[PDB]
Amino acid sequence: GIYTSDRKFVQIKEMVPEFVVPDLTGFKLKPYVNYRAPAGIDTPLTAKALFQETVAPAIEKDFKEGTFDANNLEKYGFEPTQEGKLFQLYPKNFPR
Amino acid sequence: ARNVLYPLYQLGGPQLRVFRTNFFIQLVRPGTAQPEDTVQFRIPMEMTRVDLRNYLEQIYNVPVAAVRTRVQHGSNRRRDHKNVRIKKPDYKVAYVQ
Amino acid sequence: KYVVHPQISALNADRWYQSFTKTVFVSGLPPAPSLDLAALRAAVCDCILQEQVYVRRRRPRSLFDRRQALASSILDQVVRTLVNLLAPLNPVLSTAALDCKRSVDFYWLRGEERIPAGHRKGHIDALRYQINDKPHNQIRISKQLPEFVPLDYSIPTEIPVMKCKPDKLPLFRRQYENSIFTGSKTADPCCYGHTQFHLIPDRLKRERLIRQNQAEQVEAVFRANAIASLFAWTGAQAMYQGFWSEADVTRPFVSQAVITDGKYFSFFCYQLNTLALTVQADQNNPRKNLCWGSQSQPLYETVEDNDVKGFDDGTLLQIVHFLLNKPR
Amino acid sequence: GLEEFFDDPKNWGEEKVKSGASWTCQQLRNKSNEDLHKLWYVLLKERNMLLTLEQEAKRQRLPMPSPERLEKVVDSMDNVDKVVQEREDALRLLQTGQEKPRPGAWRRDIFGRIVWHKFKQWPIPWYLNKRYNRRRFFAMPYVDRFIRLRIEKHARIEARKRSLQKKKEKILHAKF
Amino acid sequence: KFVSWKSRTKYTVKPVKNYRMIDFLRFRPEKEKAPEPFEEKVVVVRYDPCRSADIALVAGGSRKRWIIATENMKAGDTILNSNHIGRMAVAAQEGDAHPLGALPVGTLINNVESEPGRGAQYIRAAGTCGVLLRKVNGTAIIQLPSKRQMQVLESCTATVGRVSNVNHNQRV
Amino acid sequence: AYEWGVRSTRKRVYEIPGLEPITYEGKKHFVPWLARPIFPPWERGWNDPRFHRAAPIHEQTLYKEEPCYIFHQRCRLLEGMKQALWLTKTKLIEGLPKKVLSLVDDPANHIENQEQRVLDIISHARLWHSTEDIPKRETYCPLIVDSLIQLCKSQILKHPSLARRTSAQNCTLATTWNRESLLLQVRGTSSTILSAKDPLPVIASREEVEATRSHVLETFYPISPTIDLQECHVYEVKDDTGFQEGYPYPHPHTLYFLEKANLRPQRFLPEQLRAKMLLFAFANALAQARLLYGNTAKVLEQPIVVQSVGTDGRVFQFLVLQLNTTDLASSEGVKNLVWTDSDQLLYRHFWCRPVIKKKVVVEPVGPVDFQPETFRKFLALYLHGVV
RNA sequence: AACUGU
RNA sequence: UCUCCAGGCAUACGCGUAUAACAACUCGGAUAACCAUUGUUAGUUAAUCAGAAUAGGCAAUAAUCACACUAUAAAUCACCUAUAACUUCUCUGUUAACCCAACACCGGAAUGCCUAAAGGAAAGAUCCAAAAAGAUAAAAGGAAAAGAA
RNA sequence: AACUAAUCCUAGCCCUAGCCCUACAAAUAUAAUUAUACUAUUAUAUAAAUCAAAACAUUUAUAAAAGUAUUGGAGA
C-alpha cells in the first residue's frame, strides 16, 4: 500500500502479491524420488542448446526453401522489445 | 517471496502475482493460553498478515477469521568465546483465528 | 484498565461482553391512540427524500464519508419529526430529553487476576473495564421506564464463561480517569432513559462483513453494542440514585435501544438487576442482568426519484410501540 | 489443509520415515515448464511440513524422524530453481543479449575501487532525481594515497603468505 | 540552524511572532488608487518592542499599515500623503507625508529620505526632528539628527512634526 | 527604508561548430569533470497529483473578463450596514414587523413556565450538557440555539399547522445580481433553513412598496461598493434557495446563522453579523423571485418575505427581509423593505462554576442579567406565519 | 535575663 | 497467620531479554536461604494505543470562568475561486524487579494521578567487656528559655 | 615421590633476493548499507616547525674528478 498525506494508509491492490497456486491433482511428481531410479547427468541448458532445439529447425527448413530474409528475424521468434509481455526478461519485472 | 525485489507498480500496471512463494511458515504450539480456533504460526518477517490469509486460503485452503501478529525481540546477551554477542534470530508469531 | 469499544469486530464478542457484564441475552423482545399509520409512513418517507434528493450541501472532500454522512442526516431528520408526531399521543415524549451524539461512560469491576511477574508478582488485582459510548441519538426522561419483568426473575439460561484471559481476545489495558456518566450530569432533571439510537460504522456493515466472510458476526455486532451500551447507560442511571456495589438496586432498571446499519433496524431491551459485580460484592448474589434483543430488520428498500420504495411499516410500528410506552 | 502441515498420523512416533533420493537437475530439466512449477509447490509443501515437525520436536526436546527428508527436499527445490533459471537465462540472452537480468554497470566508488553498480527502478529520470545525483560515484583526491597502499598491501600479502608457507615447511622438515 | 526571521511575504498590521512590519516609504500608493495624493486615518497609537518610539497605525482606503508616530500623532487623527509638489504652501497636518517642495522653510520634519525613493532611514528615533534650513527650486537642506546638513531633491518625502517622546533627546 | 532580511540569506567546447560536447548523461550521474547535459522534457506517462500543478485561471473556459464580486461568510464589509443596503437596494425600517410582535401577545403562543424552562435550557446548554466544567462557545452556542428551537419544537402540540414546516441542515444559498453595472454575488451555506409549504405573509402593502421609490440608497464615495468582496473572473451564474426544485417546502421561513467562535477577536462584530445576514438573506429571497418570475427585471407584484436570526449564544440578532423588486440594475426606484432588531441580549454573563470568594458564593451557576424577552422575540419569529 | 548536665 | 514500616501506580527517557518455566549448585550476589548466577526452552498479539496535490482571492480589536472591567511584560490555518486525484488497513512499537554513576554504589533521574485499597521489613547467632559514638533521664544550683538592648 | 609450580616447539615473524601492477539474494553515501522522487553535487598554496648552531637571528645534508674549486652569524 501507500501512505498518503494526513498519515492515512491506502492499500493498493496491484502492489499486494497474489499467490498463484497450481493444481497438484494429476501431478505425478512428489518431493522424493526412487533410489531405484538412476540419476541423470547434469546438462545445464544454454542459449546454444535453446536456439538449436527451437529456432534452428525453422531456419533450416526455411533456408532450404529459400524463404529467409533479415527483416523476418521476428518470424523465427526474435522479440524486438520486451514491452507488452507480463514477464520481461530484461529488465526483470516479475518476482520469483 | 522474501529477499527479492518486487516490480515497481505505477498506475495502469498489472496486479502483483507471486507464482512461486519463498515464504516458509511453521505451526507452533501456543506458549500462552489461546482460544481453540486461534493458531500460532512462525512466519518470515517480510510477510504481511494479509499474505498469510491468502497463503493459507490458497495453498492450504484453510479459512481464516481473524489474525493477530507480534514480533519477538531476539536475545543478544549471549556471547561467544571471542566476546562477540550472539543474537537469536528474530521471529514473528501470528495468531490466526 | 481494559478499554472496551461498544462497536468492535472481535469474534464472538457478544459472549465475552456478557461474561464481563453478567448479562443474559434472551432472543426476542421482553415478555409483555390512533395516529394514521399511513400518515407516519409518508412523513418518514419525505424526510429521507429531503436529505438525499432535495437538500443542497457542499460535497465532502474525502469522498469516503459521503455514504456515512448521508445515513446520519436522514436518521436525525426522521427522529426529530417522529417525536413531534408521537408527542401528543405519549406525553412522556414532550417532557423527554433528546441527546445527539453525546458520550455515555460506565466503569465496573468483574473478576480478579494474579500478577504473573514483576515487583508485585503474585499480588491479586481486580479486572478493570471501561466502556465509552456515543450513541447516535438517545432520549432521557425524568421518570424510570416501566419494568418488563419483576426483579429476581430467574431463567434456566446461564451467562457465558470465558476460559481464556480477556487479553487473549484482542483487548488492551490503559490507565486513565474512571468515569461513570448517563449522558448528562446529575444536575440534569432527566436522570432516566427512554431509548437509544446506534449507527454501526461502514467497516462493520453487512456488505463489507460479507466480503470479509464474517457474515455471521452481523448479529454479534448488534448484540455486543446493545449489551455494552445499555448496561453502561443503565448502570450509570442506578448510580445516580445512590445504588452502588455494596448497595444493590432495590428496583429493576430497564431501558431499550435500537441499533441500525443505515437500512436494517434492530431493537434491544435491557434490564439491570445487579450492581454487585466484584468478587466480594458478588460473593453471594443470585440475581443476574437480563437483556432482550430482536433481529435487525430493513426499514425501507431504495430511494428512486422523489419517491422511496419498499418502506416497511412493521419496523416503524415497533418504533411507534416503543415510543408510546410510558411508566404506569 | 492443516493436516498437510503435519506428518502422517501413522508415522508419528516412528524412528524414521522411509524416503527416496532427491530430484536431480537432469530429471527436472526433462520435466516441462508447467511440471516444474507444480513440482516446486509439492517440494515446498513437504518442506513446510517438515519444518513444522522439526520446530515442534525442538520444543518437545525430541529427535526429528528422518531429518534427511528436509535436506532432500531443499536440494530438489534448489535444483528446480536453477533448471528454471537456465531456461530463463538462455532466452534472455537470445532476445536481448544482456548477460544479467537486472540492469547494471561498472562504476567507481568514492574509495577509488571499481565495482558493479546495480541499477534501481525510479519513477523520475536521474537528472530530475536530486537524491540519486546526491549519491557519490566519484573518488576524492585523497584516495591516491590509498591506491598506493592497495598496491603495497597486495605486495605485502604475497610476502606474508610466503612467510606463512615457510613456517608450514618447517613442519615437513621437523616431522621428517 | 540560523534561518532569517524577516521572511514574511505579506505585509500585515497584526503583530508577527511580536514584530509589526513598519513601512518607511511613506507614499506607497495603496490598492485602488493612482499615484496621486491620498489620505489615511491613525487608528491606534501602539507600542513597538523593537523601536524606541511608539508606532501609530495609519490606515486608508483598503490598506492598513504601521508607521512611526510623530510628536502630536494621536488615535483618530487624519494623515495625508501627497506626491504633488505644491505651487503654494500646502496645508500641513503633523504626520502628513509631503514633498520638501510643498513645505515651507522652517517646518519641523521627520522620517526623511536622503535620496528619492530610498525610504525613511533617519530621524526615526524618539524626539528627533529635521529642520528645513533652506529651500530653493527643486533642492532643499534638511538637518539630520547627527547634525549633518544634507541637500536632497524636493521629490524626497518628509513627514511634518517631531517624533514622539519629545524629550527623548534630553534624557539624562 | 530599512532592508529586512539578513544579507547572508539573500540570493568553448560548446561553441565549436559541427560537433556535440560530451556530457555525463551516459554516466546517468553528475560528475564535475564532464559537461552538464541539456535535458529534453521528461514524460511520466501518467498524471501524479502530488506533483501536478493547477492550470492558470485565464486558460479556464469559464474565465470571464467582467469581474464577479462574491460575498461569503468570512467577508467583512468596511462600511458595514451602509454598503449592504446599497448592494441589496433595500430600505430599512427600524424595529420588527408589527405582525411579528403580536404573535407572542397571544396567550396560547406563550409557553408554560417559559422563563423557567429557558433558564433550565441555558443552564443545560452551558453546564449540564457536557461533562466539562466550563464548556466553550464552540460547543454550547450551537446547543443553546437547538435547545431553544427544541422548546419551540414542542409547540407543535398546540399548533398542528406547525407540522407543515421542517428544517434542513447545511443548505446553500446563492444569487447573482447587478447594481449600477457592478456584478455582485452572495454565497452562503451552513446553518439551518426552516421551510414551510406556504409563503410568509407579506409585511408591506403595495402602496408602501411604491412609496419606497422616494428612498435613495446611501453612498460612501470614493470607496467602491465592491470593497471587501472577492473579485472572481472564473464564475457561473447560479441561483440557489438551499433545496432542489420541487422541494415540498419551497418557501423558506427563517435563515439561521451561528457565530460560535470562543474568542472575541475570532467573533465578528454585531454590525458585521447583521450585514452578513442581510446579504445572505437577500440572496435567498432573490433566488425565490427569480425562480418564480424568471430572470426578468421588474418590480415584484407579490413581495417575498424572508426571515433571518443570528446569534453567538449570548447576543441574539433578529432580521426580517421583504423582497419587493427584482429590477436591481438601477439604484433608484422601488426598494426592498427590511426590519432589523439588534443587540438582543439573552444574558449579560454566565458562570459555569460557582464563584466563591472567602467562602461566599458571589456568583451562582446561572445566567447573569437573563432577559426572557430575547426568547420571546425568537419565539415570535418561529410562530409567525402559522398563528 | 531566662534556660538548661556547659 | 502475627509484629511493625509508609511514596505508590502509569507514561517519557534510557536499557535490550536482566523478562517467564524447567534443570543445575561449579562461577556471579561481597554469607546463606533464594536467585539477579550457569544451561535449555518459552515470551510482547492494535483500523480504536503509539510511530512511520496545485494556483489565485482575503484578514485592525489577547487571555484571565471573558461579561463588566481595566491594564502592560503586548498575548490568534480558516474561508472563498479554480485545477488535480477517485473506493483504503499494511508495516513498526508492546517483556522485565530495567536507567546515568567502573559495582545489586545510602548518589542522580521528567510528567500525570492519587496517599495507602498501593508499596514494604530495622533482628546471621551469641555476649552485654572496657574505651568511644548516638539517644533518653537529673536532687540542689542555673553559664560558676524563645524575652531586652 | 609434596602442594603451589615447572617442563616443550612451532604460533608466527625479520632481513635481503626475486617480482611492479592490471585479484549469493538483498541493501547502500538520503540518517551510507532505509527496495521508488525530498536536498543538487566538490579535496588542495613553498610543508613548516621541532631540530643543529650547546641560546638565538641568515643559515641547518635528507664511478671518478672530490669532500677539491667554491659557499656559509667563513659557523653548525
Contact D22 A33 (CB under 8 A): yes
Chain D hits for F50, CB-CB cut-off 8 Å, are: none
Q: Does E172 touch chain F (CB under 8 A)?
A: no
Handedness of CA F244, F249, F250, F252 (dihedral sign): negative
Residue in the block written with cell 524577516: E6
User: Nearest nt to E20, CA vs C1'?
Assistant: H74
Handedness of CA F210, F211, F212, F215 (dihedral sign): positive
> Any idea what DSSP says for residue C260?
E
List of chains touching D (3+ CB pairs within 8 A): A, B, F
Contact B65 C213 (CB under 8 A): yes
Q: Which residues of C154-191 are buried (b: 16+ CB within 10 A; e: fewer)?
A: eeeeeebebeeebebbbbeeeeeeeebbbbbeeebebb
**Interhelix angle for C313-324 vs C65-86, to 10°?**
50
Q: What does the alpha-carbon distance between residue F269 and residue F259 come to, in Å, rounded to a whole number?
A: 10
Beta bridge partners of D13: none
Smallest Cβ distance to C11: which of B32, B34, B66?
A: B66
Structure-determination technique = cryo-EM
Contact F29 D124 (CB under 8 A): no
User: Nearest nt to B9, CA vs C1'?
Assistant: I36
DSSP H or E segment with residue C124:
strand C124-133
Q: What does the alpha-carbon distance between residue D94 and residue B43 come to, in Å, rounded to a whole number?
A: 39
In angstroms, the separation between the Cα of residue C218 and the nearest Cα of chain B is 14
Among residues F341, F282, F281, F338, the alpha carbon closest in space to that of F316 is found at: F341
Q: What does the alpha-carbon distance between residue B38 and residue B47 come to, in Å, rounded to a whole number?
A: 19
Contact F2 E121 (CB under 8 A): yes
Q: What does the alpha-carbon distance between residue F121 and residue B43 come to, in Å, rounded to a whole number?
A: 60
Q: Which of F7, F9, F266 to substitute to test the interface with E, most E CBs within 10 Å?
A: F9
D45's CB contacts (< 8 A; 6+ apart) are: A31, B59, D4
Protein residue at shortest CA distance from C1' of H11: C175
Closest CA in chain B for residue F45: B11
Q: Which of C35, C56, C182, C186 to substitute to test the interface with F, most F CBs within 10 Å?
A: C56
In angstroms, the separation between the Cα of residue A84 and the nearest Cα of chain D is 14
Contact D27 A39 (CB under 8 A): yes
Q: Tally Cβ neighbours within 10 Å of residue D77.
A: 21
Protein residue at shortest CA distance from C1' of H41: D59
Distance H16 C1' – F328 CA (angstroms):
79
- Quick check: F291 and F273 in contact, CB under 8 A? no
Closest CA in chain F for residue D126: F28
Q: What does the alpha-carbon distance between residue C308 and residue C316 come to, in Å, rounded to a whole number?
A: 15
Instruction: Show contacts of A55-63: CB within 8 Å, 24+ apart.
Output: A55/D94
Q: Does F79 touch chain C (CB under 8 A)?
A: no
Among residues D111, D109, D170, D167, the alpha carbon closest in space to that of D142 is found at: D111
User: Nearest nt to D117, CA vs C1'?
Assistant: I28
Contact B61 D48 (CB under 8 A): no
Chain A hits for B53, CB-CB cut-off 8 Å, are: none
D35's CB contacts (< 8 A; 6+ apart) are: A27, A29
> Any idea what DSSP says for residue A85?
-
Q: What angle do CA E171, F1, F7 make, to 5 degrees?
A: 105
Contact D24 A40 (CB under 8 A): yes
Contact D94 A47 (CB under 8 A): yes
Contact C168 B35 (CB under 8 A): yes
List the alpha helices (DSSP H) in chain D.
Answer: 25-30, 33-60, 68-95, 130-134, 143-175
Q: What does the alpha-carbon distance between residue F7 and residue E164 come to, in Å, rounded to a whole number?
A: 31
Chain A hits for B5, CB-CB cut-off 8 Å, are: 95
Q: What does the alpha-carbon distance between residue F173 and residue F153 come to, in Å, rounded to a whole number?
A: 24
Taking the C-alpha atoms of F342, F343, F346 and F347 in order, what is their torsion angle to the nearest 10 degrees?
Answer: 180
Chain A hits for D74, CB-CB cut-off 8 Å, are: none
Pairing relationship of beta strands E130-136 and E108-110 according to DSSP bridges: antiparallel
Q: Which nucleotides of I are covered by protein (CB under 7 A)?
A: 9-23, 25-30, 35-44
Q: Which of F25, F28, F46 to substitute to test the interface with D, most D CBs within 10 Å?
A: F28
Sheet holding C2-4, edge to edge: C2-4, C124-133, C104-114
Contact F169 C55 (CB under 8 A): yes
Closest CA in chain D for residue A49: D90
Strands (E), chain B: 17-18, 26-28, 39-43, 67-72, 91-96
Beta bridge partners of C140: C97, C193
Burial class (CB in 10 A: 0-12, 13-18, 19+), F336: buried
Q: Tally Cβ neighbours within 10 Å of residue D14.
A: 12
Task: Write down the number of H helices and E strands in chain E.
Answer: 0, 10
What is the longest distance spanned by two Cα atoms in chain D?
Answer: 72
Distance H71 C1' – E46 CA (angstroms):
14
Chain D hits for B5, CB-CB cut-off 8 Å, are: 102
In angstroms, the separation between the Cα of residue D132 and the nearest Cα of chain F is 8
> Any idea what DSSP says for residue F59?
T
Residue in the block written with cell 429557558: F118
Distance I69 C1' – F59 CA (angstroms):
95
C-alpha cell at C216: 455471521
Residue type, F223: I
Contact D125 F42 (CB under 8 A): yes
- What are the φ and ψ backbone dihedral angles of A51, each rounded to 5 degrees? -65, -45
Pairing relationship of beta strands E78-81 and F63-71 according to DSSP bridges: unpaired
Pairing relationship of beta strands E108-110 and C253-260 according to DSSP bridges: unpaired
Beta bridge partners of B36: none
C-alpha cell at C299: 426499514
User: Nearest nt to F55, CA vs C1'?
Assistant: H83
Looking at chain F from residue 281 to 320, which residues have their Cβ under 8 Å from any Cβ of chain C? none
**Interhelix angle for C65-86 vs C37-49, to 10°?**
150
In angstroms, the separation between the Cα of residue D41 and the nearest Cα of chain A is 8
- What are the φ and ψ backbone dihedral angles of A46, each rounded to 5 degrees? -130, 165
Among residues D92, D87, D114, D117, the alpha carbon closest in space to that of D104 is found at: D117
List of chains touching E (3+ CB pairs within 8 A): F
List of chains touching B (3+ CB pairs within 8 A): A, C, D, F
User: Nearest nt to C121, CA vs C1'?
Assistant: H97
Closest CA in chain F for residue B11: F46
Q: Tally Cβ neighbours within 10 Å of residue C58.
A: 9
Q: Which nucleotides of H are covered by protein (CB under 7 A)?
A: 9-10, 16-20, 39-49, 52-63, 65-67, 72-76, 78-97, 112, 118-120
Distance I25 C1' – D102 CA (angstroms):
13
Q: Tally Cβ neighbours within 10 Å of residue C79.
A: 19
Question: What Cα–Cα distance (Å) separates residue B9 from each residue in A13, B6, D121, E74, F48?
Answer: 10, 9, 10, 68, 14
**Interhelix angle for F270-293 vs F81-88, to 10°?**
10
Q: Does F139 touch chain C (CB under 8 A)?
A: no
HSE-up (13 A, CA, CB side) for residue D71: 7
> Any idea what DSSP says for residue C138?
E
Distance H135 C1' – C120 CA (angstroms):
37
Sheet holding B67-72, edge to edge: B26-28, B39-43, B91-96, B67-72
Q: What does the alpha-carbon distance between residue C288 and residue C21 come to, in Å, rounded to a whole number?
A: 9
Smallest Cβ distance to F1: which of E3, E62, E118?
A: E118
Strands (E), F9-106: 63-71, 90-94
Handedness of CA E86, E88, E89, E92 (dihedral sign): negative
Chain B hits for C214, CB-CB cut-off 8 Å, are: 65
Chain B hits for F51, CB-CB cut-off 8 Å, are: none
State this model's resolution in angstroms: 5.7
Q: Does A14 touch chain B (CB under 8 A)?
A: yes
- What are the φ and ψ backbone dihedral angles of B76, each rounded to 5 degrees? -115, 10
